[PDB]
Amino acid sequence: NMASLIQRIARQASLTFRQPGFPENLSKLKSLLTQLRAEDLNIAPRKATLQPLPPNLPPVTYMHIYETDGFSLGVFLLKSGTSIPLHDHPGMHGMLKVLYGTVRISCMDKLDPRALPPEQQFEPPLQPREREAVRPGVLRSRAEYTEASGPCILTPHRDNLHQIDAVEGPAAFLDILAPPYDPDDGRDCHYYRVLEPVDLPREVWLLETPQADDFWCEGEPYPGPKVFP
């Protein structure tokens, strides 16, 4: 009979991400994500431990639900006080929906490339190779989102960089990426720092940076209804 909501989300993601028809399909996908709750995935909301995080445990974990050539579908689970650092989604669309907790999502884009003015100074100061590499960007928004918020969308050309901070305890979100990342095809995940020199939208300076030493994501089992071909 009636398929599970997560199966319906996967089915609709496949139809949307395989052009006329795209906006209507994306709207339907957003409406399905709006209805999704953590209990529909058998994920109980996680609350703070109030203990420090030991060095051998990741700050973030990921449950994979499904992927096709057109999209990837899963859940990121952030522990208290953690962040997913600022990163891009080259050539991709993304849709996320908060399942529990509160996250602060900062949304940014790279701009067109203009060079850093010679006298510009930063705190902390930049090394010479960093001064050569910094590029202009725009900070478009920075707001808090909960399960009562709508889904958040990004596209290849707008809000393509985002940072996600767990606010006042653990949080989790469902994420759809379309197409998935593919490093062997020029679609990798790059990380950035926004720099403080010495009102939104507002121009910022962006520095591409390696994955942070204290950030990584481990898989954990997905407990909810399964998506079937």
């Binding site: 990921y62 998935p180 990342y181 995940c189 790059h190 994501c217």
Partner: peptide, 14 residues
Amino acid sequence: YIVKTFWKGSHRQC
């Protein structure tokens, strides 16, 4: 170690 993932690209999973 580095793993190619659908969901975080070339990811250092450690």
